[PDB]
Amino acid sequence: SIFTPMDWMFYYFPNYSRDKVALMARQIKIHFAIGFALVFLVYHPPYKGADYGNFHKSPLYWYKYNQLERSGQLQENLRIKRDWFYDEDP
Amino acid sequence: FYILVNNNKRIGIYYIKLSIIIGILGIVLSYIIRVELYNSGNRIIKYDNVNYYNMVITLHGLLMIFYIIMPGLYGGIPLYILPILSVITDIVLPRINNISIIIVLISYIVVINSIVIEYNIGTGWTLYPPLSIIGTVIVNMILYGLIIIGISSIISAINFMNILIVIDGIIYVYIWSIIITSVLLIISLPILNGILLMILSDIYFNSIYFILNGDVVLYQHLFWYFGHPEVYILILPAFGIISIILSVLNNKIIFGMKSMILAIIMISILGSIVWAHHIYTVGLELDTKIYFNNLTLIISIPTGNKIYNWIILYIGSYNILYNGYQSLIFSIMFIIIFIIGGITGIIISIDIIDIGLHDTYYIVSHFHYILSIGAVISLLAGILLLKDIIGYYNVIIKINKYFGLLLFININIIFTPQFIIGFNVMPRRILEYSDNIIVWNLISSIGSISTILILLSIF
């Protein structure tokens, strides 16, 4: 089990956790596979994950985006505030 | 007799006595450094004699690690109480125990004799080639000491492992700490011996491993493969002592005994596969750096569990018991100090942060808080706890609140500024420095002279 207090595992799944020695082995094996899978399935795969046009936009993104879009803040935020180096000296 | 004695308890005393004696030379070397770093410009070392300073830092590091702290925590206390904590009478291999302490002394005499007779040059305690293999004979002598010290460490590790066969009681947390430290020595020492032989081959047998077409980074891998387990070998016995002191002096059963034991085991396994965080700036592969950085952070998880288990040991203890005993204060001080050292270790584990903080005094302060304060205080705390059993006297340390307070304040003055200096930035292993770092270096120097004065008060 992952991020699971084993006292809960003992209580709610007595038959499954009846053999504690076997249960300990599964704990090691399960987390061994996860670590192995992360390297070869999340990190390794080549030429993948570069579709930057498909950035995930969660509902919280749209809630804040629409709130600023409704007002002028979004337009004001995106506006370039300064595009010159020196100010004119009077 | 005095040299022929095989009694393990006597040998344990000899380890403590020898560490103090060698400690004086280590303290002298440490004092030479901070006096020189008081301000820019030479103070006690001539500009034409800068080679001596390199030897001072090299010996300061070597003596303190292999000749002072390791014998004190792994040879001194364990040889005294470990057979007592076990229900057995004496150590399993009595004759081996005798030769181990004698070996440590002979290696010390070889090292100090080399100072007097050989030309004084330095290459750091890590002995990085090619600098180590283009030096004079003092480097050859230092190698002989390390190899000789390695023999004593391994045979002592064999001695402790045999307790599992004869132990007639329960394996307490302290016993586990010593056993796992022995396991680390058994697996790490042979690797160290192999690479040290290669250093000798280049120095003395015309080998070409550390010249062009021979990767010098090869040494760093093999050395640090032993190097980092060594720091964990130093501290793990300290963890065992803290567990005993806190439980005994608070009359509280050790909470989560199995969690403590598994934490020690986990640290050793992780500590054996994270050595390359000492090699971030050499230009390792991207995936390699990510792996070591990720696994290095994981070491905090088991180390954190032990910290919290210690805290609950002190919480809720009876108020009527006097809490001003030096042993209790030192044990509590260790938790506060170790957290500082460990947290800074996690900061420098991030490799991009380490790019700026490698080879700076921030790293110095990191391992001083853990070793110079934490390990020493743990060794002091254990010796104080066993004062009645050991039976030493003629010192005022058992109930001395002035010594504890002054030591804590002044050691923090030495090494807190060194964190700040790290960002300024001041490199390590340096005698001169820019004028604008004087203020912080001056404050630490005042801290160093103050600490030495405090030691005279114990007598």
Binding site: - | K9, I84, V87, D168, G169, V248, D388, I390, Y393
Partner: protein, 107 residues
């Protein structure tokens, strides 16, 4: 985890209405450095040290039983300072179980 011994309600019923927890002092007394006599030679000072061992002390309860000095670890069970030979007789670690055999009993 350990949370003390289990207690049944019947075990808490007193045999008298005036029973209260016994007020026996478990402070062994006032101590300091062991103070030897100048007249005592090496042998007799050793006897003096052996007679000042806190781990040989106990507190006698009202029923005649004594609660001795106890420690979590056996390091506190040897004479202080530690003698050359400590555990001449192997310390016994007492385990408890519910198993029994008929030979031990008689009808």
């Amino acid at each position: 985890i350990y949370e003390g011994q289990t207690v049944q309600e019947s075990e808490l019923i007193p045999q008298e209405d005036d029973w209260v927890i016994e007020e026996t002092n478990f402070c062994l007394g006032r101590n300091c450095y062991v103070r030897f006599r100048e007249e005592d030679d090496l042998a007799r000072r050793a006897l003096h040290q052996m007679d000042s061992q806190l781990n040989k002390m106990h507190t006698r309860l009202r029923d005649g039983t004594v609660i001795p000095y106890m420690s979590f670890h056996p390091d506190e069970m040897v004479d202080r300072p530690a003698p050359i030979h400590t555990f001449s007789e192997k310390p016994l670690l007492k385990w408890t179980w519910d198993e029994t055999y008929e030979e031990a009993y008689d009808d």
